Write a protein that binds this DNA or RNA. Structure first.
Lengths: 113, 276, 116, 269, 115, 115
RNA sequence: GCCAUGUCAUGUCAUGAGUCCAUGGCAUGGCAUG
RNA sequence: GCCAUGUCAUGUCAUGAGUCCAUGGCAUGGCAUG
């Protein structure tokens, strides 16, 4: 079989966290302008925050929030609303990056199998 | 070198590293004068005694020895913890290690004392023989007092050469010094999420505790009825348990079995430790 | 500006964000295996049935699909972000952020700060 | 020049000596970050934890601290024994002492931790509060890690200033010196085997009373001298010098010896 | 005047005084060997080195020198004093003291009996 | 040349030497009190009578007298010698030893090496 | 393991001028306080 | 007095997806080996 219970529960969990996490970031994070201003003046940053600047997580957050403010989100934005456009009776992709062309290309790669 | 296993065998040896040299004979001599030679001279004032034998120098030397080793391993292992740094340092400054270094230079044969060093019935032989270690430190002390500016670097380069083999042996073969970096600190948690529920009584057991002879541990991961889902071995119970967890996480048919088992059990019974 | 307790939540959120996508691409099939499973359910194990009713499995499958088509774009950059991070590269590691996109933003908080 | 009871009463103090500065802010921040703040963050790798809080810096600094003090006193007291040197050094690097230097700079108030430092019912309060000592050591390590070449001399100057009053206080708390030969001297003058001239320890030093009393006595119990000192040896020496000063007494026992047949004289009976 | 306790100390002091000078002249080299030893010290055995920082050896050598140079004066009779002693000679046996000098001191103490 | 065991004896002897002379000048009367005591022995403590029969007491008095008459010379020097010693002073502390005296001697040992 | 101060035992080497005595140094170990 | 490794108890703060559960951080102390 394809799907195993153990695989399913981890997937549901991962998708749930995935969405919850991107949301928290967009909620909490400033864009790169505030980030850059902080890193070029570190003497005015509170000390417990200084190590955060040596690590990747904050910049990535700022960069993501940036893409958001610039409306280049798209794949990530669709994800946050995906649950709400999900319907058991619509059988084809809710992501518009998957067009009807890509779909059959794949069906016959596992149909060759 | 050109390893002596290769075709030039009889070539002079690179070992031990060239000893830095004390230019003031007053000081060079004092290094080798033990107090048993001095404190019995009734015509000496206490002040004259202290300036004669090597104990002030041993004192100075022990510090520089300890300082330089500290910097050396600090810089060479940027990601070592303080406990790791401290444990490694113990290997470099120990009595045994310094003593061994001392014999390396035949300092023990140059040391002046008032009693028989070679007597094998002497009660000196059944001790720690710390005098040999002392004189080596005293040599370092001698070096500093002679020319503190020029000799501190030479002490640095000399000791780095002495330390390399000792470090290299200890990082590879010492258990406390091993690397914790591929451990998932969330493993026991991950496992409980996947298969865990209160009445399963999923617990870790220590089957072997670390001892002086055997500094390792074995922890079994078990359910209530005794079934072992994993085993792990490591420096302490924490690490061993983590590897036991990781062991269980790799057995996917088993995980799937227990996840389904959980799904079939009603929340409580499920949420109680003893459904009685 | 930046606050400590918010920073902790941010750093942690980002870590889960990445870990979660990695797990999805790791465990999930693409949309063809999803469709087959959702269309023959008497042949799938009984316990997975409610999950097939929900969005998570399909969304994971769609993402796994984009991965197989090499239309990932941004999501691959994110999973690669950590090992490409360097403190002395002060410019965006995401290439969708153009050096051009940056100033509408440098200046909108430039005008935003002066009504202040 | 602050008598502080003259005209200097409310005037600003030149104390503590000006702190050398860590120019790397990455490092300056870190000295003050305790581990309780770091190790509970589950999204950090062990490596990232170690490079975050101050434990590496405390380690390095503790070594430099001990190093610099050790040279300082080695040079300042060319005639000190190793025990004197070692004992003196204990006052300089001790927990209580480093703790004090730390508070002097308010490091205790700047230390970022995860729990309540001011809670007076907290169990942190009946322990050693070694953390306060640690943060001070960590400052030294930070200075060293930041710029080892330029900052080691600045540290020497600085620590020499901090150390000076503690030393002056320990060294005070000279006179005639002990004759290590006094007991011999006395036996030479009045001694013979049957006098059973011996020393008695009336008091052995204790933690409560770090002193000793030794009496010098002859066989019949007569005390010829009393001496008081740090240990039994010094006390005995001081008893002897006491006995050596009473010349009427010496002359008496010398005359007595001269009067005894060496037949009896040379026996303990 | 004289007390027993002072007397036993005096005999012992005098005895060793001469006994000490004897040992010195016997064992010590003169000042040139000292100078050679201090002016190298690399062929000087280590245990003898601290001795060069102290006064005893130099003074020991200097005296041995005065001896080889026969400027001993006062100290040779000291070594000779015992065999020159006789109880019935009431006159100073050291010739660095002449009986012009005694006069000065004798009338000096009737002077202090007048105090 | 110099041997370890001999050096310890010299150092020790030099020490006893100086300490002994010191003791003598401290404890002993000069020759006037000495003569007074020896000439009336019925009034001196009975135990010291043999000491009066020996030389030390007389030698001690003679030296003490020499001291009072400030004719000590060398002996005054010997007691001050340690206090005058400097390792960085490389020439003799005795004023009877002149750079005019130390020819005859260093050139005599340039004579002795070649035989 | 390691450190100081204090105290005690055993082995050993010295020192002292009445020595069948007296005083210390070292080495190895013990105990107490820190 | 103090150091490392190991192991345990009390208090406290976190983490986790089945939580009346599970796993850790710190602080204070106990015991073992070196």
């Amino acid at each position: 079989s394809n799907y195993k219970y153990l695989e399913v529960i981890q997937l549901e969990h991962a998708v749930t966290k995935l969405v919850e996490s991107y949301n928290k970031i967009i909620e909490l994070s400033p864009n790169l302008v505030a980030y850059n201003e902080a890193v070029n003046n570190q003497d005015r940053v509170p000390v417990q925050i200084l190590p955060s600047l040596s690590r990747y997580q904050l910049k990535l957050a700022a960069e993501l929030k940036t893409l958001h403010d610039l409306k280049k989100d798209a794949i990530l934005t669709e994800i946050t609303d995906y649950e709400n456009e999900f319907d058991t009776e619509q059988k084809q992709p809710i992501l518009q990056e998957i067009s009807k062309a890509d779909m059959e290309k794949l069906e016959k790669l596992e149909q060759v199998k | 070198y050109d390893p002596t296993k290769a075709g030039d065998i009889v070539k002079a040896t690179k070992w031990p590293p060239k000893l830095p040299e004390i230019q003031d004979l007053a000081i060079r001599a004092r290094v080798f004068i033990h107090k048993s030679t001095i404190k019995d001279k009734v015509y000496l004032s206490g002040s004259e005694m202290i300036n004669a034998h090597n104990e002030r120098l041993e004192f100075l030397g022990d510090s520089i020895l300890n300082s330089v080793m500290t910097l050396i391993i600090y810089n060479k292992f940027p990601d070592y913890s303080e406990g790791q740094l401290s444990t490694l340092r113990m290997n470099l400054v120990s009595n045994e290690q310094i003593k061994q270094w001392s014999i390396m230079y035949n300092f023990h044969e140059k040391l002046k004392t008032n009693f028989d060093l070679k007597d094998e019935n002497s009660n000196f032989q059944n001790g720690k023989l710390k005098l040999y270690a002392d004189v080596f430190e005293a040599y370092i002390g001698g070096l500093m007092e002679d020319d503190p500016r020029n000799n501190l670097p030479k002490i640095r380069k000399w000791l780095r050469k002495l330390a390399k083999p000792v470090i290299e042996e200890a990082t590879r073969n010492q258990v406390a010094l091993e690397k914790t970096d591929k451990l998932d600190m969330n493993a026991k948690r991950q496992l409980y999420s996947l298969i865990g529920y209160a009445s399963l009584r999923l617990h870790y057991v220590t089957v072997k505790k670390p001892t002086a002879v055997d500094p390792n541990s074995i922890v079994e991961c078990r359910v209530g009825d005794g079934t072992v889902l994993g085993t792990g071995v490591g420096r302490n119970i924490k690490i061993a348990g983590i590897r036991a967890a990781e062991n269980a996480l790799r057995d996917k048919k088993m995980l799937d079995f227990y996840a389904k088992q959980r799904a079939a059990i009603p929340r409580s019974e499920s949420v109680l430790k003893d459904p009685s």
